[PDB]
Amino acid sequence: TVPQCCYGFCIDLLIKLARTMNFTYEVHLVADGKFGTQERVNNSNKKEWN
Amino acid sequence: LNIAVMLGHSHDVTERELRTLWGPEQAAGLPLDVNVVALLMNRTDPKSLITHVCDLMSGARIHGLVFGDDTDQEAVAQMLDFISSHTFVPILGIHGGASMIMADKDPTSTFFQFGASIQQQATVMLKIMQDYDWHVFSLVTTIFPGYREFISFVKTTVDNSFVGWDMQNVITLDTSFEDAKTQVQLKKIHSSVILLYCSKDEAVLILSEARSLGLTGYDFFWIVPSLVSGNTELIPKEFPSGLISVSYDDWDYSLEARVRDGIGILTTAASSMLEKFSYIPEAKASCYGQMERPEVPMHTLHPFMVNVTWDGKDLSFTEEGYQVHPRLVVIVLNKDREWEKVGKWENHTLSLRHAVWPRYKSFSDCEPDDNHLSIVTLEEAPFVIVEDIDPLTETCVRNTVPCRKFVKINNSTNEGMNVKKCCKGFCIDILKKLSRTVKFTYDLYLVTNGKHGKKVNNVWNGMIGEVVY
Amino acid sequence: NVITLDTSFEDAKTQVQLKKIHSSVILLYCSKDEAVLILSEARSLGLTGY
Amino acid sequence: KIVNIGAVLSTRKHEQMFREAVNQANKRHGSWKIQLNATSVTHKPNAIQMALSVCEDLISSQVYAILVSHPPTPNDHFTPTPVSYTAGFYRIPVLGLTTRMSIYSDKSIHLSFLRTVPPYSHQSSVWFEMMRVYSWNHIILLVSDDHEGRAAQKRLETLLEERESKAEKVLQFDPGTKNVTALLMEAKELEARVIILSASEDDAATVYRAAAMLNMTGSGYVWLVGEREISGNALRYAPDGILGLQLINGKNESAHISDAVGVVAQAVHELLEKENITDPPRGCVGNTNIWKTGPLFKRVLMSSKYADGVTGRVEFNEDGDRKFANYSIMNLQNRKLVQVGIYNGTHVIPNDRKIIWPGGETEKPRGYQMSTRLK
Ligand SMILES: *[C@@H]1O[C@H](CO)[C@@H](O)[C@H](O)[C@H]1NC(C)=O
Ligand SMILES: *[C@@H]1O[C@H](CO)[C@@H](O)[C@H](O)[C@H]1NC(C)=O
Ligand SMILES: *[C@@H]1O[C@H](CO)[C@@H](O)[C@H](O)[C@H]1NC(C)=O
Ligand SMILES: *[C@@H]1O[C@H](CO)[C@@H](O)[C@H](O)[C@H]1NC(C)=O
Ligand SMILES: *[C@@H]1O[C@H](CO)[C@@H](O)[C@H](O)[C@H]1NC(C)=O
Ligand SMILES: *[C@@H]1O[C@H](CO)[C@@H](O)[C@H](O)[C@H]1NC(C)=O
Numbered sequence: 001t002v003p004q005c006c007y008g009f010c011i012d013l014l015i016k017l018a019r020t021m022n023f024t025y026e027v028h029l030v031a032d033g034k035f036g037t038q039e040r041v042n043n044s045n046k047k048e049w050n
Numbered sequence: 051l052n053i054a055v056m057l058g059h060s061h062d063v064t065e066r067e068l069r070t071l072w073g074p075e076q077a078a079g080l081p082l083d084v085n086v087v088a089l090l091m092n093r094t095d096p097k098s099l100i101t102h103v104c105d106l107m108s109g110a111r112i113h114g115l116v117f118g119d120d121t122d123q124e125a126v127a128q129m130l131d132f133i134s135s136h137t138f139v140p141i142l143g144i145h146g147g148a149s150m151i152m153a154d155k156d157p158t159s160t161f162f163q164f165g166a167s168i169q170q171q172a173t174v175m176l177k178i179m180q181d182y183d184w185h186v187f188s189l190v191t192t193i194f195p196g197y198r199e200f201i202s203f204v205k206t207t208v209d210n211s212f213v214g215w216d217m218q219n220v221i222t223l224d225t226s227f228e229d230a231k232t233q234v235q236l237k238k239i240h241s242s243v244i245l246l247y248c249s250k251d252e253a254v255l256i257l258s259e260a261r262s263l264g265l266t267g268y269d270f271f272w273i274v275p276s277l278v279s280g281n282t283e284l285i286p287k288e289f290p291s292g293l294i295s296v297s298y299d300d301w302d303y304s305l306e307a308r309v310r311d312g313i314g315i316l317t318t319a320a321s322s323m324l325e326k327f328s329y330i331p332e333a334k335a336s337c338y339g340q341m342e343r344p345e346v347p348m349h350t351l352h353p354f355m356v357n358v359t360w361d362g363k364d365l366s367f368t369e370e371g372y373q374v375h376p377r378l379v380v381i382v383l384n385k386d387r388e389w390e391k392v393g394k395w396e397n398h399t400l401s402l403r404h405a406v407w408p409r410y411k412s413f414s415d416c417e418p419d420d421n422h423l424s425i426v427t428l429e430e431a432p433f434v435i436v437e438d439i440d441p442l443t444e445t446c447v448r449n450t451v452p453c454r455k456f457v458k459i460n461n462s463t464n465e466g467m468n469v470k471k472c473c474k475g476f477c478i479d480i481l482k483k484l485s486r487t488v489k490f491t492y493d494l495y496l497v498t499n500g501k502h503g504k505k506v507n508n509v510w511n512g513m514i515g516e517v518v519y
Numbered sequence: 520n521v522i523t524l525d526t527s528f529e530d531a532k533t534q535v536q537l538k539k540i541h542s543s544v545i546l547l548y549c550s551k552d553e554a555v556l557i558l559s560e561a562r563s564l565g566l567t568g569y
Numbered sequence: 570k571i572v573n574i575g576a577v578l579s580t581r582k583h584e585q586m587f588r589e590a591v592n593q594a595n596k597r598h599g600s601w602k603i604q605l606n607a608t609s610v611t612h613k614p615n616a617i618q619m620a621l622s623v624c625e626d627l628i629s630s631q632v633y634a635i636l637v638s639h640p641p642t643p644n645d646h647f648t649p650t651p652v653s654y655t656a657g658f659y660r661i662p663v664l665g666l667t668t669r670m671s672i673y674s675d676k677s678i679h680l681s682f683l684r685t686v687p688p689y690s691h692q693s694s695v696w697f698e699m700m701r702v703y704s705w706n707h708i709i710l711l712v713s714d715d716h717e718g719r720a721a722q723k724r725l726e727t728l729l730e731e732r733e734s735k736a737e738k739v740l741q742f743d744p745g746t747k748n749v750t751a752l753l754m755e756a757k758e759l760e761a762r763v764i765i766l767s768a769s770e771d772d773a774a775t776v777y778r779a780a781a782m783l784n785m786t787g788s789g790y791v792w793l794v795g796e797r798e799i800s801g802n803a804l805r806y807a808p809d810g811i812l813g814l815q816l817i818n819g820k821n822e823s824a825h826i827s828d829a830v831g832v833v834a835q836a837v838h839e840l841l842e843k844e845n846i847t848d849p850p851r852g853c854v855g856n857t858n859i860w861k862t863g864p865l866f867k868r869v870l871m872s873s874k875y876a877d878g879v880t881g882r883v884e885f886n887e888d889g890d891r892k893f894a895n896y897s898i899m900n901l902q903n904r905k906l907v908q909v910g911i912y913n914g915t916h917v918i919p920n921d922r923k924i925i926w927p928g929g930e931t932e933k934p935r936g937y938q939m940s941t942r943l944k
């Protein structure tokens with residue numbers, strides 16, 4: 001979990017929101033790099049989001 | 051080392067005693083061979099049980115007792131739970147009053163019955179309905195202890211599934227003997243398949259009200275749990291035919307088989323204890339009474355019985371004391387008011403069916419019906435394409451209808467199993483439109499006798515021949 | 520189809536023919552004397568809704 | 570119409586005073602008919618001896634109800650399980666004195682068990698009323714792994730789900746564990762700052778010690794503690810600002826037993842007009858039968874309301890326990906117990922005395938602390 005430096009489009013909106021209202025935000029990156037939907041694992045009778 | 055078993059006037063005593071003695075002597079050689087002390091008492095009384103406990107503890111420190119019974123009384127198991135907890139003697143549940151597991155045993159008790167929990171019945175019913183593709187749900191319940199948690203479990207199980215069952219609200223009766231409020235709540239009763247979680251006494255009046263409203267039709271279905279259908283010999287005239295019930299009976303496992311399984315489990319537990327510890331369990335100095343402090347210096351058998359393997363089958367138990375692989379046979383009411391097996395459940399917690407669809411007929415009233423119209427369809431035409439069921443915990447896609455095909459086992463053994471498949475195509479869409487317009491259920495059949503057919507020897511073959519016949 | 524009552528004072532056949540009673544607007548061609556019992560049965564079934 | 574009723578009582582003086590109480594209850598307003606005898610027994614520790622004595626005395630004396638009192642030793646549990654099990658063979662109703670265990674509330678395990686005291690699960694209504702009057706929305710629940718705790722949390726969830734409100738977190742404890750630092754830190758790392766405690770006395774004491782160690786007794790926190798979790802070492806180890814619940818008329822053996830015997834006498838007098846009465850056998854050996862009048866007794870007990878007695882009214886719920894009990898608000902001020910309200914029927918009945926809060930605050934705090942920390 002090395003420190004990266006992400007910037008782009010949504011960062012401006014996030015900064016605007018933090019300026020309008022008091023926010024202390026920390027960004028994170030998903031390990032699998034997927035949006036996340038319903039998946040099937042062992043004991044397939046389970047509906048969990050990844 | 052010392053095992054005791056009791057039965058009430060079941061059969062001849064000496065032959066059963068000899069068989070039980072021979073039981074552990076056929077195999078499973080262990081340094082401390084277990085003995086059998088079999089006694090036949092027809093009386094089930096508290097102080098009689100206390101005297102039996104005193105006799106067994108004075109009888110070479112009987113390590114465990116197997117309790118058998120003939121009557122159907124749930125209070126016997128409740129009374130015996132306290133005795134088992136106090137005497138520090140494990141007791142197994144066999145057919146009889148203690149066969150059913152309803153009360154929750156104390157954590158310090160050593161009671162483990164052969165019965166099945168309600169949750170297992172719920173998932174068995176869910177599997178049966180999934181096989182029947184009965185997505186319509188209707189839960190009619192009455193105020194009884196433990197039903198609210200069962201409803202919570204069944205809803206948190208159904209909503210977790212990917213099938214997408216109906217989410218009809220539970221139609222809970224306010225109280226028994228309602229001559230007016232039942233008609234008020236009758237508005238919410240609008241479905242096809244109704245699940246009934248009630249008692250045997252009120253089941254008669256519930257079914258009478260259903261008959262008055264007319265729920266005994268071919269399209270309507272009823273599922274009754276094991277507690278209501280406790281006795282298969284007492285069949286009231288108000289029970290409609292085609293009812294689906296799940297229970298367990300001696301039709302597939304006799305008393306000899308059950309006691310064999312019990313003694314095998316006891317021997318495996320004793321062997322595990324001897325492998326782990328090097329102490330012989332001993333009973334209390336006094337069989338009953340509270341004169342000294344309650345202490346259990348020796349570890350119990352709860353962790354030893356987690357892993358049990360006997361005769362190639364893992365007859366293990368869970369933390370709550372439930373069988374991992376119970377019997378859970380399925381019984382459907384016969385035309386002449388009998389019960390027959392239509393599938394088992396011991397096959398690695400899977401579902402088995404004998405492929406018998408039409409078994410429902412109205413008997414409370416007389417009303418013929420012919421909505422079940424069979425339809426025969428081919429496979430070679432591009433307008434209808436068949437697909438195998440995907441082994442991904444789901445039957446098939448939602449945009450199709452079930453169909454059946456006969457597949458011969460070999461090139462000479464003519465025997466076709468009714469494999470369940472889903473047929474999709476343009477003709478399937480036409481059939482769906484016709485079903486939604488005319489409002490009649492339509493079945494599906496697949497051609498297996500060659501091509502369409504032609505007039506040969508003044509005999510029609512194929513689909514045309516089936517239509518003519 | 521017309522839901523024609525067989526005869527008056529039916530404590531069981533009315534519940535049998537109740538299956539055909541599934542609609543919103545009901546036309547009642549009956550008499551005043553039997554109208555009371557018809558409306559009582561409707562109230563029992565719950566036909567007094569908005 | 571001559572019957573005998575057996576009783577299980579603590580000491581000889583209590584036995585004779587209850588005998589004279591039931592005699593005068595026979596001689597009071599309910600009279601002018603065939604009377605009934607009186608039988609009493611002690612809570613003898615020997616289980617087999619007490620069971621055989623109960624059989625020989627009560628069962629041979631045509632008993633229709635069982636009078637079971639609280640054990641003479643509060644320290645020892647002495648749960649009235651064997652008596653209920655014996656009475657369940659013939660569906661014989663019993664009348665517990667002060668058994669508040671939630672296991673007896675369930676009718677599946679104990680087919681015939683009646684009592685005039687609500688269990689700990691009935692405190693869910695009081696907690697819900699407190700939340701409604703104090704406008705609490707974000708709460709957490711601390712329940713130990715036990716049947717009573719599971720019943721209480723299920724009751725709380727069922728009572729709270731009607732308003733579409735859900736607790737942020739529900740933690741679990743164990744009967745014997747002493748390390749709850751991780752669970753306490755998890756509870757602290759939450760928006761809610763109100764704690765509801767329902768567990769054994771030792772577990773409550775150790776979790777309160779851990780909370781005091783981690784500075785959880787400061788300002789901005791509200792503690793809700795059950796009835797049995799405030800006594801014992803809790804009073805010594807708990808400073809001021811801790812709320813609690815106390816039951817009015819919770820421990821009055823004479824009054825409760827008098828009310829119970831009056832209720833059962835009126836019920837049996839009303840039911841004696843029935844066509845048939847089931848007679849128990851002279852001994853509990855060799856007889857295996859069920860009473861046709863068992864369900865009749867249960868129905869007549871459920872459907873009977875008693876507005877006359879020591880309490881304002883006596884009625885039974887679906888579980889058969891007492892309904893609409895008297896709940897008194899209990900507060901700890903200067904290491905002393907202070908009552909700041911009585912809830913006769915779970916209504917808004919406050920008092921003029923000011924309610925103190927942990928950390929010396931004199932005003933009601935709020936559980937909304939977003940902290941502007943959004944990952
Ligand atoms: C919250 O935002 C307001 C914006 O006017 C600012 O004045 C205030 O100091 C902020 N509070 C905190 C704790 O950051
Ligand atoms: C105990 O259970 C484990 C669980 O996998 C199993 O591997 C092991 O063989 C069992 N041992 C005995 C003696 O049953
Ligand atoms: C098709 O016709 C041939 C005649 O050439 C006949 O031998 C065969 O059995 C027929 N097949 C079917 C399936 O009818
Ligand atoms: C009532 O109880 C028994 C009869 O069952 C008897 O021994 C006792 O003397 C009776 N008491 C009176 C006052 O008659
Ligand atoms: C409790 O467990 C934690 C583990 O996070 C440990 O750091 C702490 O020392 C333990 N406390 C005691 C008293 O054992
Ligand atoms: C609690 O407060 C004291 C002083 O008030 C402080 O020394 C201690 O570190 C605090 N503990 C925690 C866990 O915040």
Ligand SMILES: *[C@@H]1O[C@H](CO)[C@@H](O)[C@H](O)[C@H]1NC(C)=O
Pocket residue numbers: 820821822823824879
């Ligand atoms: C309980 O109340 C009754 C009547 O209200 C009274 O006679 C009895 O003494 C009280 N109990 C105690 C322990 O004071």
Ligand SMILES: *[C@@H]1O[C@H](CO)[C@@H](O)[C@H](O)[C@H]1NC(C)=O
Pocket residue numbers: 881913914916917918
């Ligand atoms: C209970 O207290 C309320 C006050 O909120 C009162 O209105 C009601 O009459 C009381 N009921 C009884 C039975 O004392």
